[PDB]
């Protein structure tokens, strides 16, 4: 049974970002303006066209689809096709109320690479963590069974070595070509890859092996069909591991941000302090203050 | 008006990309019309980008939505918009030939984690038996080919290399900038052949490579993603230079290795690349895949 936007009104302020290639758009709207003091609140609405489901496509092209002809020559031709309802799903995400840090992160990527030494991390990044980081209340809600409980795909309930595996916010669950799940560990205070030590190895292995095994049993998808990894920098500073279909070229799966869990585990087995000592490469917005901070602790 | 045929029986998904919301289908058409004898068609379908004004308008009309879930300030929904947002770009090849089929066909991939042993016992023996030609490299290195496009060359036979646009780039804009660097010293097959003796070749590549791109394109190093493939397609060490902003195919973690961390990895673990297990993806029909899977069963 269908619902409405969790707010009234939406008046466009700004296209934070759009991409014709990815068929996606992120908008900052003013909402609820006809109440209280008349200023309203900020929201972000994100609209993404969805992947095709080949069977519905094959069934459509078997009949007489609604078409207009755009180019014609001999054996080539391009139409505009207007499918029935069922092929038109647009994946819609709402952030509301949206904070100033949301508005910043969803804006116009003009990105710069940076190489962060262990020392740059203790000295510069760590003490500046608040400014990179978003509320993890949603993570607590899942771990506490207050949101998304009926979506949980698997749980290892151990307080220390356990975790919850659930469909990622980006996956609309309608097909397996873009399978995307997330594992969040039960244990609090592991912010990111920089916190990881051999003490976490049991936790890591369980995410890797019981996560893959749970995906094999739920979706029949084999581990050699999965790309399993973490982000550095993450947006939410509670360790989280991303399980994607390998043939899905997921945004954020690039060598400049993604780290395979299998390698992370073996890195720890070979090199207990590897994540505190070594240098990690990632991208930051041009104008992000932390970039400036870091550029200045290494140039001179 | 109409599709150029009647009936569609799916024969094969030649290629798909959920990320780009595109599929390439081969179907059999006309099987319940004319003589009864079906033909070949390719039909490519692609979702369209949004238009701001149509989206704004839809949103201020407060539409109805099917809730997927909510959590705190977050929520997601299925939206079934009115016709004007729903257009699909439908390209048809009819009748299509076996050439059209081969043009669009892509193999599905499979992950493998190749130990240092796996590489010694299985991949290396396989690759000396079977490899794609590295002539085209040779042609460049010794000026018979593409000398009209060199961006930079350091000639030192032991640590030098030539830097040319990759064929993937039409050179009309810097958005999708892509270059390869091929080294002068011969027989470096891939990453698996790298040791601390390579440190000058590597350093060389990264550093003079960036300087060349700076002077030629006005593009700073922090704007560049620089890396090698494992497994490469061509077994003569080759370094890839792409614009940071360009989400280049093949820059995924399951394939790409940052040049600079390959360097530091040599510095702290001299045997790294002969001992450590490396991860990569193979085509479903690659004989190497069956070999590795059989060795690890
Ligand atoms: C709030 N939240 C985030 N995730 C998922 O948790 C992971 C956190 O992962 P991470 O810490 O490594 O950070 P990441 O940067 O990947 O997450 P973010 O959500 O900021 O995604 C990165 C970028 O991808 C882009 N993007 C494409 N679609 C969306 C979308 N729908 N929402 C936000 N960003 C999107 C944005 O440009 C964004 O900055 C992400 O994969 C996110 O979908 C959630 N999953 C559930 N199940 N319930 C949640 O409530 C939830
Ligand atoms: C022949 N050639 C190739 N390159 C470029 O050299 C680099 C070699 O780099 P690499 O050794 O690590 O190989 P990579 O795997 O990147 O090569 P490429 O993208 O071309 O892969 C090879 C081929 O296999 C095909 N292919 C890739 N995946 C699939 C799949 N999944 N299914 C079916 N076919 C696939 C490709 O379309 C292509 O024909 C590539 O980035 C390539 O564009 C060249 N550059 C110049 N300047 N002059 C050349 O003549 C030249
Ligand atoms: Y006020
Ligand atoms: Y006011
Ligand atoms: Y079915």
Swiss-Prot record, chain A:
Effect of residue 48 to A: Reduces decapping activity
Subcellular location(s) per record: Cytoplasm; Nucleus
GO biological process: deadenylation-dependent decapping of nuclear-transcribed mRNA; mRNA cis splicing, via spliceosome; mRNA methylguanosine-cap decapping; nuclear-transcribed mRNA catabolic process, deadenylation-dependent decay
A Pfam entry, by short name: DcpS
Stated consequence of mutating residue 167 to A: Reduces decapping activity
Impact reported for residue 46 to A: Strongly reduces decapping activity
Motif nuclear export sequence (NES) in this chain: 105-117
Catalysis: reaction(s): a 5'-end (N(7)-methyl 5'-triphosphoguanosine)-ribonucleoside in mRNA + H2O = N(7)-methyl-GMP + a 5'-end diphospho-ribonucleoside in mRNA + 2 H(+)
Modified residues (N6-acetyllysine): 101, 105
Consequence when changing residue 236 to A: Reduces decapping activity
Effect of residue 231 to N: Loss of decapping activity
Sequence motif: Histidine triad motif, positions: 238-242
Subunit and partners: Homodimer. Associates with components of the exosome multienzyme ribonuclease complex, such as EXOSC3 and EXOSC4. Interacts with NDOR1.
Similarity-based family: Belongs to the HIT family.
Function: Decapping scavenger enzyme that catalyzes the cleavage of a residual cap structure following the degradation of mRNAs by the 3'->5' exosome-mediated mRNA decay pathway. Hydrolyzes cap analog structures like 7-methylguanosine nucleoside triphosphate (m7GpppG) with up to 10 nucleotide substrates (small capped oligoribonucleotides) and specifically releases 5'-phosphorylated RNA fragments and 7-methylguanosine monophosphate (m7GMP). Cleaves cap analog structures like tri-methyl guanosine nucleoside triphosphate (m3(2,2,7)GpppG) with very poor efficiency.
Name of the protein in question: m7GpppX diphosphatase
Protein's organism: Homo sapiens (Human)
Chain's gene name: DCPS
